[PDB]
């Protein structure tokens, strides 16, 4: 039992799961293990306990939590059912609250109940009245006594009426039922009883939860105070960036165990957008093409080429020695027409260049002028039509001859020198819809908690409405016309005779950078001029969206046709007309985020509505969830550093990068993957994205929701692993072809996620480092994605939601010289290194330390930031860390020093020599200074003997003004310095102490003991680290 029931306490549990007898059953238990019970007194103990139970029954509005009716009830003195189990030592009662068993009792098999009361398989329960029995019967709710009244609960009472009617009540009125119990405190057999149950929910509708989060979704990072102004409104206006997960909670009382949920997301922007569109192909009857023109086919991002489509009555097109066979045929009321599809390019070719897979031509019906359509097929009735190439060197001309009806026509193409691109630019009221699925489980029914993507890598349908308009001149024998569509696309008709058709039309594709040629839409418009009572020129047009895959341009669906009619009773006339027109583009999966940024549907003004479906039970949400879109630029900063940040092994410099758009998963160290499939939603099967938590990428099969669904072997598993070399880097391992299906929180690999087309990422984002004067860089040309395991910091305990991510990334930088030239196996320590999770180490030679520097550049990971801030440059940020110069010093303790004393200390000081104790500087030869530091270690590498300076000269200037310069030799030093080593005095304070010895100095000069030696002593030292030459002096004194 979860939760447990205390000594003499009361608790309640809902009967659920497989084999559960009916809905709306709750089990109450009181713990009676605290005393002995026997066949002699069992009737008295159950009677005593069940007398003291009180039950409270409520109805509520499921969104707001407002109470809408409440009753409180007590068991009668006879006619109830209550039991005792000897094995588990508990008294129990089952109450039935909901239809149909509100007034009548229901029977619960003892096999089932053993889940909660396992003792029941060991011995049969005691009944009331002391018997034992094999089966349990509910006490019905409609039998209990109203404590308000002292009588049986009324049949007319609103709570009982509601519970008896719950199916339509929950759906229509958003009603929820809630029940709880308590035991009025009493003493029995020398023990005492007291308590109150947890409440339980009997029924509730399928909704997004709206308390405390009023919108049904939330972003943890905004609820905690981390986004500035935006934290004022986190409970009713959630914001999220393009590729990340947003958290949500659903209430579901139909569910048991795990459930697949499918979701539908609708995107919208205030007011119309300006869209840029390129012409993929041009289709016309041979009468409508101009007599002479210049053309060369454009080549799109996916390799597809623009084509020119001629329709004619002739069984071939003829061009001298070359003849072209038709790609396909169609018939209209017994007349037969042929379609020729051509690419103008390099050389006349007899094999297919590429294909078009279904193609609808629309025409006005002869009877009624309503639209009708036919699909063009090959001469053996297969649907895929081939496209041919004609061409030659630039300025070569090709004449094609064909027929329209009875009349021969010639067209004269000149092979252009540069690709013909036609751009149309229009204003359209765009919107888009997308679909997504996840598998969710819970330990706290009926609450299902989960997170869903901001933008899924599914097919996404971008959709919008526009206008077509026609103008026309009609006459006794022929008619002439023009049409406009997509703001500035124009089509024209050569004069159409009475009873004859003519065709024209265009196929268009998005004119943006990465995605062009991957999706298209086709309009083919036929015209007919005929005499009735009135003269009628009629137009009919197809509308079909298409996609390119493996060089077939293929039909996705057909939308409805459209039609326009111009009517004249007068013989000569001019007329005009209009119709609505529709536009639809289906994205190919990898392109889906780029499309939404490019068209303008994703940005600071966008708003999204979400609905949800349970795939086990076939239910839809009775409310909708809401969220809003945001784009935020990066920023870089550093904590203030002096020279002290570079002395001893525990000192370092901290750089903080702020970039919320790099946090795709609200949990730090979290991971997920994604794949595309058909999903069940409503009563239909629709292409969508399925999210899998973890670090393995899958190629699934079947339809998500049904029992076909099978995710196969893991195609690739990504992991961060330790590696060889010094220190030990942690870096990403796994097949890089699949990074466009993996999400983490690391900016050194997050830039691939839904931003990779043709196998190359659109934005080379992340962190880049350069170092000087020892030239090094990361990433190097050979370096993989994920060269270090950089992750964001977690929100701490005073925050409302701890352990969740923060937009700050903290990077630690160390610069040092003490371990330069160390070796770790085969490795030589010099240059720039990654260490641990968030650490960089730079090791440089002694002579290059002051002035050494690192320059860090951070570029955004998200394509929306690159797009909206390209011009201003706010998508990159830079910082540089460098080692400052410091003032060293050498000094005898006092200006005057007495000759009486045998040794007079000379102290050297320079901050950058400091280390943990002990450390010492040795002297010898021509005054060479050697530094040793045995206790120094940095990430496992330990310090090496360094050569850091020299004593340059030592001199005495005597009382007659003569100056003596003492030559440094292996013999002279040992007298002047009796110990050849100077020790450091305290930890990390570089101040070394040496014993220049007067007793030695006398003998080394042979100068008269004191009588000559009212003199100035001098010493000088050069250090390589700073470059300074220090000097110190003292007047040697005695009575003179
Ligand atoms: C989408 O909308 C987002 C939310 O507003 C925008 O994010 C914000 O970006 C600002 C910088 O970019 C702005 O400036 C460029 C041109 O230079 C233009 O593209 C836009 O104008 C764009 O908004 C940045 O705001 C700062 O610059 C503003 C200049 O326009 C200025 O008005 C602000 O006052 C800021 O100086 C935001 O960065 C945050 O700014 C807030 C200030 S406030 O909340 O905006 O008032 C800081 O909060 C403050 O923190 C200090 C701590 O010391 C407190 O003392 C103080 O009480 C508190 O207000 C944040 O620290 C700072 O990060 C940035 N907002 C967020 C969410 O970080 C985004 O650019 C819009 N996108 C587009 C497409 O433009
Ligand atoms: C694809 O296949 C196409 C169909 O056969 C070829 O088209 C033909 O192109 C000819 C030019 O191609 C030649 O030159 C290029 C270099 O630019 C080479 O790469 C080719 O190998 C080839 O040698 C074109 O001829 C015209 O241009 C010539 C320039 O070299 C020159 O002879 C004349 O200036 C030509 O006008 C064909 O166009 C037709 O040519 C005939 C004559 S002929 O067939 O060339 O002998 C003309 O008839 C003449 O009309 C004049 C009117 O002034 C009369 O005075 C004369 O009595 C009469 O003969 C036609 O008017 C003219 O249209 C052209 N054929 C057609 C009809 O399309 C193409 O080369 C192939 N591409 C490749 C290289 O694969
Ligand atoms: C907002 O929504 C986020 C959805 O992305 C939620 O993130 C998920 O967080 C889980 C832990 O959160 C718990 O603790 C926080 C406090 O930090 C509480 O606020 C939460 O209420 C909750 O109690 C996290 O679960 C994992 O970590 C747990 C340790 O805390 C551990 O007990 C679990 O067993 C999990 O490992 C989710 O992280 C991922 O979890 C999946 C498994 S599952 O989704 O939990 O079932 C792991 O996948 C597995 O990986 C192993 C590899 O060992 C494979 O063998 C196995 O095949 C595969 O299933 C992931 O590796 C692991 O990262 C985390 N979900 C994701 C996808 O990141 C977040 O909590 C929500 N916020 C709130 C406030 O509720
Ligand atoms: C383009 O011309 C093609 C011929 O060059 C046409 O292909 C022939 O289509 C026949 C009729 O089917 C078509 O009905 C409409 C006509 O355009 C149109 O909606 C569709 O294109 C639709 O496919 C087709 O016959 C069908 O019915 C036969 C019953 O007699 C049956 O035997 C076939 O299996 C088929 O379903 C032709 O197939 C040929 O049928 C021959 C018998 S007969 O139809 O000549 O009486 C028989 O020898 C053999 O089965 C088969 O060769 C088919 N003809 C050829 C040569 O493949 C095509 O429809 C035109 N396209 C359009 C759209 O106009
Ligand atoms: C369809 O797909 C193609 C593939 O992605 C596009 O070709 C690439 O276009 C780049 C810029 O795109 C913009 O300008 C086009 C006109 O030049 C325009 O048609 C697009 O709609 C879009 O607005 C093009 O960059 C060139 O043009 C820039 C002017 O905007 C100019 O600044 C550049 O110097 C360059 O001349 C790509 O060429 C590539 O440029 C790379 C730098 S970047 O400009 O992309 O940042 C450079 O690293 C690379 O070496 C170079 O090749 C060009 N890419 C290729 C592979 O050719 C094509 O334009 C799209 N066409 C349509 C119908 O819009
Ligand atoms: C690093 O190590 C050095 C070891 O040589 C330290 O030098 C010693 O510093 C003492 C005072 O330091 C304090 O005041 C500084 C400003 O004056 C300040 O920058 C420091 O950060 C620190 O706050 C100095 O003591 C003098 O002042 C005392 C009162 O404050 C006075 O009591 C002493 O008699 C003296 O006047 C030391 O001076 C020498 O002291 C010898 C006695 S003892 O101090 O060892 O007990 C005495 O026999 C001698 O005659 C006198 O010269 C001084 N040591 C030396 C050899 O000069 C230094 O502060 C450390 N720096 C840091 C930043 O850690
Ligand atoms: C397109 O131009 C072609 C040229 O090849 C021409 O073909 C002619 O076909 C008719 C049959 O007409 C039937 O089909 C068409 C649709 O294909 C329908 O519109 C009609 O209602 C009919 O059902 C043949 O009668 C022609 O055969 C030729 O006759 C020539 C003399 S002619 O004076 O009769 O034209 C002879 O020289 C040829 O030997 C013989 O093959 C045929 N015409 C030609 C010259 O091949 C159609 O007229 C044109 N179709 C349309 C849509 O107008
Ligand atoms: C720290 O950096 C200083 C300055 O760059 C460097 O001084 C250079 O000293 C070498 C000799 O040092 C060698 O022996 C000692 C043993 O005492 C070892 O500890 C060292 O590891 C070395 O093996 C001298 O060769 C340099 O003097 C000048 O060299 C020039 C050429 S260079 O390429 O070697 O620099 C000549 O052209 C000049 O004529 C000559 O004066 C000296 N460098 C300079 C420019 O003064 C130390 O070795 C470094 N200390 C350590 C241990 O890193
Ligand atoms: C300042 O007073 C000093 C003490 O009297 C003198 O310098 C010392 O005297 C040493 C020897 O006497 C004379 O030699 C120097 C140099 O040759 C002469 O310039 C003066 O006449 C000195 O009095 C002297 O030793 C040096 O010279 C001798 C040879 O005479 C050599 O054997 C030695 O190797 C050495 O080169 C030194 O200059 C100094 N000795 C000591 C112990 O310090 C001198 O009177 C005057 N200084 C000078 C040199 O003018
Ligand atoms: C668009 O044209 C495509 C030609 O590359 C074609 O894809 C190939 O289909 C074959 C099996 O289909 C047969 O029929 C087609 C008729 O279009 C033939 O072109 C093809 O050679 C086959 O005989 C299959 O092996 C594979 O999916 C494709 N072949 C390659 C190159 O891998 C499509 O059938 C066509 N339209 C679509 C997508 O339906
Ligand atoms: C019910 O019956 C048993 C006797 O069958 C009671 O147990 C005795 O209680 C007394 C004091 O209450 C103890 O001193 C004895 O140890 C018990 N005797 C036996 C035979 O076990 C039990 O307490 C009774 N329960 C109630 C609530 O009356």
Swiss-Prot record:
The keyword Signal applies. The mushroom-shaped unit cells of the Sulfolobales' S-layers may consist of three SlaB subunits and six SlaA subunits. GO terms for cellular component: extracellular region; S-layer. It is found in: Secreted, Cell wall, S-layer. The gene is slaA. Belongs to the Sulfolobales SlaA family. S-layer large protein. May form the highly ordered outer sheath. Glycans are attached at residues 31, 41, 247, 266, 313, 329, 348, 439, 488, 516, 530, 552, 604, 685, 846, 885, 926, 960, 989, 1013. Keywords: Cell wall, Glycoprotein, S-layer, Secreted, Signal. Glycosylated. C-terminal glycosylation sites are modified with a heterogeneous family of glycans, with the largest having a composition Glc(1)Man(2)GlcNAc(2) plus 6-sulfoquinovose (QuiS). Its main location: secreted. It comes from the Archaea. This is S-layer protein A. It comes from Sulfolobus acidocaldarius (strain ATCC 33909 / DSM 639 / JCM 8929 / NBRC 15157 / NCIMB 11770).
């Amino acid at each position: 039992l979860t939760p447990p029931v205390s000594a003499g306490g009361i608790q309640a549990y809902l009967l659920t799961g497989s084999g559960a007898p009916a809905s709306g059953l709750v089990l109450f238990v009181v713990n009676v293990s605290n005393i002995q019970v026997s066949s002699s007194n069992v009737t008295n103990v159950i009677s005593t306990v069940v007398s003291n139970i009180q039950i409270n029954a409520k109805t509520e509005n499921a969104q707001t939590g407002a109470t809408t009716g409440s009753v409180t009830v007590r068991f009668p003195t006879s006619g109830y059912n209550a039991y005792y189990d000897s094995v588990d030592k508990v008294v129990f009662v089952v109450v039935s609250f909901l239809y149909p068993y509100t007034t009548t009792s229901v029977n619960i098999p003892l096999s089932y109940l053993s889940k909660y009361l396992p003792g029941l398989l060991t011995a049969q329960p005691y009944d009331e009245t002391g018997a034992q029995v094999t089966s349990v019967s509910s006490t019905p709710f409609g039998s209990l006594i109203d404590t308000s009244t002292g009588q049986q609960i009324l049949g007319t009472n609103p709570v009982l009426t509601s519970y008896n009617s719950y199916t339509t009540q929950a759906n229509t009125n958003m009603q929820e039922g809630v029940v709880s119990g308590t035991l009025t405190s009493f003493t029995l057999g020398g023990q005492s009883f007291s308590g109150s149950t947890v409440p339980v929910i009997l029924y509730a509708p399928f909704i997004f939860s709206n308390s405390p989060y009023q919108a049904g979704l939330y972003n943890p990072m905004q609820v905690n105070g981390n986004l500035g102004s935006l934290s004022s409104e986190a409970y009713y206006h959630p914001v999220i960036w393009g590729r990340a997960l947003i958290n949500t909670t659903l209430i579901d009382t139909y569910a048991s165990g795990s459930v697949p949920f499918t979701f539908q997301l609708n995107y919208s922007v205030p007011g119309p957008l300006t869209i840029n569109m390129a012409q993929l192909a041009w289709i016309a009857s041979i009468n409508n093409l101009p007599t002479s023109f210049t053309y060369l086919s454009y080549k799109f991002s996916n390799g597809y080429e623009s084509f020119l489509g001629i329709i004619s009555n002739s069984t071939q097109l003829t061009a001298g020695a070359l003849t072209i066979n038709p790609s396909g045929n169609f018939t209209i009321n017994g007349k037969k027409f042929y379609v020729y599809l051509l690419v103008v390019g390099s050389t006349n070719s007899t094999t297919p260049v590429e294909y078009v897979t279904k193609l609808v031509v629309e025409y006005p019906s002869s009877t009624n002028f309503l639209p009708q359509g036919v699909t063009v097929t090959t001469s053996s009735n297969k649907y895929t039509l081939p496209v041919y190439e004609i061409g030659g060197p630039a300025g070569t001309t090709i004449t094609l001859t064909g027929n329209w009806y009875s009349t021969p026509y010639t067209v004269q193409i000149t092979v252009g020198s540069t690709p013909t691109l036609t751009n149309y630019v229009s204003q359209i009221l765009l919107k888009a819809v997308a679909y997504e699925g996840i598998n969710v489980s819970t330990t706290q029914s009926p609450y299902y908690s989960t997170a869903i993507l901001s933008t899924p890598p599914s097919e996404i349908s971008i959709t919008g409405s526009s206008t077509i308009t026609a103008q026309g001149k009609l006459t006794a024998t022929s008619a002439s016309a023009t049409v406009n569509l997509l703001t500035n696309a124009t089509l024209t008709y050569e004069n159409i005779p009475l009873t004859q058709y003519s065709f024209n039309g265009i196929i268009v594709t998005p004119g943006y950078a990465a995605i062009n040629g991957t999706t298209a839409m086709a309009y083919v418009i036929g015209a007919l001029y005929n005499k009735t009572s009135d003269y009628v020129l009629s137009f009919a047009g197809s509308q079909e969206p298409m996609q390119v895959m493996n060089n077939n341009l293929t039909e996705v669906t057909t939308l409805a046709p459209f039609g326009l009619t111009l009517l004249a009773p007068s013989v000569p006339a001019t007329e005009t007309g209009t119709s609505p027109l529709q536009l639809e583009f289906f994205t190919v999966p990898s392109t889906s985020y780029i499309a939404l940024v490019d068209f303008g549907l994703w940005g600071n003004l966008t708003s999204v509505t979400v609905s949800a479906y349970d795939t086990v039970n076939n239910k839809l949400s009775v409310n909708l969830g809401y969220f809003y879109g945001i784009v935020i630029p990066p920023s870089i900063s550093t904590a203030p550093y002096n020279y002290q940040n570079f002395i001893c092994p525990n000192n370092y410099v901290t750089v903080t990068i702020y970039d919320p758009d790099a946090v795709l998963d609200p949990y730090p160290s979290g991971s997920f993957t994604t794949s595309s499939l058909p999903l069940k939603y409503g009563n239909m099967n629709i292409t969508g994205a399925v999210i899998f938590p973890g670090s393995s990428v899958y190629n699934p099969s079947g339809v998500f929701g049904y029992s076909n669904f099978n995710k196969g072997a893991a195609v690739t598993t990504f992991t961060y692993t330790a590696q060889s070399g010094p220190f030990s880097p942690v870096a990403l391992t796994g097949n890089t072809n699949y990074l466009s299906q993996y999400a983490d929180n690391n900016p050194t690999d997050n830039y691939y996620f839904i931003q990779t087309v043709n196998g190359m990422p659109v934005l080379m984002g992340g962190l880049s480092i350069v170092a000087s004067p020892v030239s090094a860089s990361l990433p190097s040309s050979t370096s993989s994605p994920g060269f270090m395991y950089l992750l964001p910091s977690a929100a701490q305990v005073p925050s409302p939601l701890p352990g969740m991510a923060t937009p700050n990334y903290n990077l630690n930088i160390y610069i040092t010289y003490k371990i330069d030239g160390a070796t770790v196996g085969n490795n030589m320590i010099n240059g720039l290194y990654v260490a641990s999770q968030n650490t960089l180490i730079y090791v440089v030679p002694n002579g290059s330390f002051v002035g050494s520097n690192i320059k860090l550049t951070y570029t955004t990971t998200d394509y929306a930031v690159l797009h909206y801030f390209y011009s201003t440059g706010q998508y990159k940020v830079f910082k540089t860390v460098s080692v400052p110069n410091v003032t060293a010093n050498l000094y005898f303790p006092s200006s005057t020093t007495p000759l009486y004393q045998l040794s007079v200390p000379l102290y050297l000081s320079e901050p950058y020599y400091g280390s943990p104790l002990p450390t010492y500087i040795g002297l010898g030869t021509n005054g060479t200074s050697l530094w040793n530091s045995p206790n120094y270690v940095l990430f496992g590498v330990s310090a090496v003997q360094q050569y850091l300076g020299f004593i340059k000269s030592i001199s005495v200037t005597l009382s007659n003004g003569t100056t003596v310069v003492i030559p440094l030799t292996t013999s002279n030093m040992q007298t002047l310095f009796p110990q050849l080593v100077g020790q450091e005095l305290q930890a990390c304070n570089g101040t070394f102490q040496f014993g220049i010895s007067i007793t030695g100095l006398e003998k080394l000069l042979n100068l008269n003991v004191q009588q000559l030696n009212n003199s100035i002593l001098s010493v000088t030292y050069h250090d390589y680290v700073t470059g300074e030459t220090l000097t110190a002096t003292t007047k040697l004194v005695a009575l003179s």
